[PDB]
């Protein structure tokens, strides 16, 4: 590997990785660079020290910067700011990619940037808006990855073309994350839980942090969880199609981790008191297990059974939670 490509894998290892590195053939570098490029865009987007005036063109034009050898950004106050400051090193390697991979990455960057710039302006209102936001920031990652798999010809064209299944992969992950991250987000001035949902419980999203609202908080939590569970049938469909082993593991691992994190957050008061995280050894076993459909399906079913037997009769979402788990299982 060249010096510039080695520096890219160094950033990958620091910002996320062996899963990406286990990818077969040309997929490995294409996904490494796709990661770093979208983490750079997100690093701009997350930076609350960048005025909306500055941020907008940065988001809209990011896809062009990939083609500008000397472009970097020196004003970030985020942790990962290295990928922006050394961006020329990443964009060099982007431009060293086969064109079929470059064009995938450029197109997704372009579309995510439009979508990100759209939401600087607003919080998520409806469940429809939550889906749109998640598509912009996560569904489009699924889409891009899927097209690399197909463009590299390690997977059937259908993987690259079925945008909804790929969308659903990114939505599951991103909703799981938003759900679990309630408090650290709240404490950082960020609101990502859809107002349409939380507003049926409390006057303000921040109210879920007060002890007196814990019952309502957990109810809302469970409703959102139940909402996230609707993506699982697509996740299963998506995973059932994958024929390359390294791609399978790449895709299955984050899904099984999200599944276990959701089950962990289900009906869990601790979501509103801190970060709920699966144990390291638990995570390691799931990663090692998630290597074929039968195994991934058993994992999904086991955690879904666990949620199912934990559903409170009085939870206002309890019949929906039961319906979706029933659908998944069958
Ligand atoms: O700043 C943070 O630490 C968290 O950011 C969240 C936010 O700002 O909303 C949010 O950022 C949104 C935009 C940046 C996306 C960067 C990314 C992530 C994973 C990748 C994996 C492979 C290739 C490229 C990748 C690019 C975020 O990072 N959420 C964590 C989970 C995102 C799911 C991405 C994803 C989607 C579908 C997938 C399908 C199959 C395999 C992996 C998949 C991975
Ligand atoms: Mg982020
Ligand atoms: Mg972001």
What three-state secondary structure class fits 214?
helix
Query: Catalytic annotation on 303?
Result: no
Taking a C-beta distance cutoff of 8 angstroms, is the pair 99, 148 a contact? Answer: no
For tokens 């990855």, what's the residue?
A: 145
Q: Which ligand is nearest to the CA of 147?
A: 1
- Is the shortest distance between the CB of 38 and ligand 1 below 6 Å? yes
Q: How far is CA 151 from CA 100, 105, 135, 156, in A?
A: 7, 12, 21, 9
- The single-letter DSSP state of residue 310 is T
CATH number at 1-330: 1.10.600.10
Distance of CA 40 to the CA centre of its chain: 15
Overall resolution, Å: 2.0
Residue pair 205/186 in contact (Cβ under 8 Å)? The answer is yes
Number of Cβ within a 10 Å radius of residue 212: 8
- Any idea how long the chain is? 330
Q: Are 253 and 285 in contact (CB under 8 A)?
A: no
Task: Tell me which DSSP letter residue 211 carries.
Answer: G
Question: Do the Cβ atoms of 278 and 260 come closer than 8 Å?
Answer: yes
Q: Torsion-angle region of residue 122: left (phi > 0), alpha (psi -120 to 50) or beta?
A: beta
Nearest to 16 by CA among 253, 259, 329, 233: 253
CB neighbourhood size of 313 (10 A): 5
- Distance of alpha carbon 113 from alpha carbon 107, whole angstroms: 10
Cα–Cα nearest to 173, from 112, 280, 254, 229: 254
| Torsion angle of the four alpha carbons 313, 226, 181, 86, in this order, in degrees rounded to the nearest 10 | 170
For 56-70, b/e burial (b = at least 16 CB within 10 A) is bebbeebbebbeeee
Give Cβ neighbours of residue 65 (< 8 Å, ≥ 6 apart).
71, 87, 91
Closest listed residue to residue 86, CA positions, set 27, 158, 3, 25? 3
Within 10 Å of residue 324's Cβ, how many Cβ atoms?
23
Record the tokens describing residue 10, joined without a space: 């160094």
Within 10 angstroms of residue 139's Cβ, the number of other Cβ atoms is 27
Give the residue, out of 11, 15, 83, 138, with the most ligand 1 atoms within 8 A of its beta carbon, to mutate for a pocket test: 138
Helix (H, G, I), strand (E, B) or coil at 46: helix
Query: Closest by alpha carbon to 193, among 221, 212, 171?
Result: 221
Report the structure determination method: X-ray
Query: Which residues, including other chains, have CB under 8 Å from residue 214's CB and lie 6 or more apart?
Result: 269, 272
What's the rounded Cα separation, in Å, for the pair 55 and 75? 11
- Say if residue 200 carries a ligand binding annotation: no
Q: What is the DSSP string of 107-134?
A: HHHHHHHHHHHHHTT----SHHHHHHHH
277 is in an annotated binding site: yes
Backbone phi, psi, residue 111, to 5°: -70, -40
> Rounded CA gap, 156 and 152, in Å?
10
Token look-up 């107002």 returns 195
Rg (CA), the chain: 20
- How many whole angstroms from 186 Cα to the centroid of ligand 3? 15
Distance CA 287, CA 181 (A): 22
Instruction: Single out the residue of 58, 162, 168, 161 nearest to residue 114, CA to CA.
Output: 58
Query: 């390291």: which residue's tokens?
Result: 280
Count CA within 13 A, CB hemisphere, residue 214: 9
Catalytic residue from among 201, 250, 272, 303: 250
Q: How far is CA 182 from CA 82, 225, 266, in A?
A: 27, 12, 13
Angle between the N-to-C axes of helices 27-46 and 140-151, in degrees from 0 to 180, rounded to the nearest 10: 160
The response to whether 78 counts as a known ligand-binding position is no
Active-site residue, 165 included? no
Whose atoms come closest to the Cα of 37: which ligand? 1
- Alpha helix stretches (DSSP H) within the chain: 3-15, 18-21, 27-46, 52-65, 82-85, 87-95, 99-119, 127-134, 140-151, 157-161, 163-180, 182-186, 195-198, 214-229, 232-240, 245-265, 280-289, 293-308, 318-329
Query: Which residue matches tokens 């080695």?
Result: 6
Distant-in-sequence, close-in-space partners of 235: CB < 8 Å, separation ≥ 6: 168, 169, 172, 255
Per-domain residue ranges for the chain? Answer: 1-330
Torsion of CA 54, 178, 137, 170, to 10 degrees: 170
266 classed as catalytic: no
């Amino acid at each position: 590997l060249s010096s510039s490509l080695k520096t890219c894998y160094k950033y990958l290892n620091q910002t996320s990785a062996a899963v990406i590195q286990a990818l077969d053939g040309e997929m490995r570098n294409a996904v490494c660079i796709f990661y770093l490029v979208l983490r750079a865009l997100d690093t701009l987007e997350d930076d609350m020290t960048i005025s909306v005036e500055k941020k907008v063109p940065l988001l809209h034009n990011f896809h062009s910067f990939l083609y500008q050898p000397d472009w970097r950004f020196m004003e970030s106050k985020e942790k990962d700011r290295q990928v922006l400051e050394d961006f020329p090193t990443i964009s060099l390697e982007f431009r060293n990619l086969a064109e079929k991979y470059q064009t995938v990455i450029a197109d997704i960057c372009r579309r995510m940037g439009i979508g990100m710039a759209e939401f600087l302006d607003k919080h998520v209102t409806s469940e429809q808006e939550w889906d749109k936001y998640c598509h912009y920031v996560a569904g489009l990652v699924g889409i891009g990855l899927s097209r690399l798999f197909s463009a590299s010809e390690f997977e059937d064209p259908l993987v690259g073309e079925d945008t909804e299944r790929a969308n659903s992969m990114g939505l599951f992950l991103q909703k799981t994350n938003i759900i679990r991250d309630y408090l650290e987000d709240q404490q950082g001035g960020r609101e990502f839980w859809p107002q349409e949902v939380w507003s049926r419980y409390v006057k303000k999203l921040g109210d879920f942090a007060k002890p007196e609202n814990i019952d309502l908080a957990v109810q809302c939590l469970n409703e959102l969880i139940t909402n996230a569970l609707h993506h699982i049938p697509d996740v299963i469909t998506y995973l059932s199609r994958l024929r390359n082993q390294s791609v399978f593991n790449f895709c299955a691992i984050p899904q099984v981790m999200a599944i276990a994190t959701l089950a962990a957050c289900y009906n869990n008061q601790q979501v509103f008191k801190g970060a709920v995280k699966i144990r390291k050894g638990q995570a390691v076993t799931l990663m090692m297990d998630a290597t074929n459909m039968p195994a991934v399906k058993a994992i999904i079913y086991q955690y879904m059974e666990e949620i199912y037997h934990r559903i409170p009769d009085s939870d206002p979402s309890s019949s929906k939670t039961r319906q979706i788990i029933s659908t998944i299982r069958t």
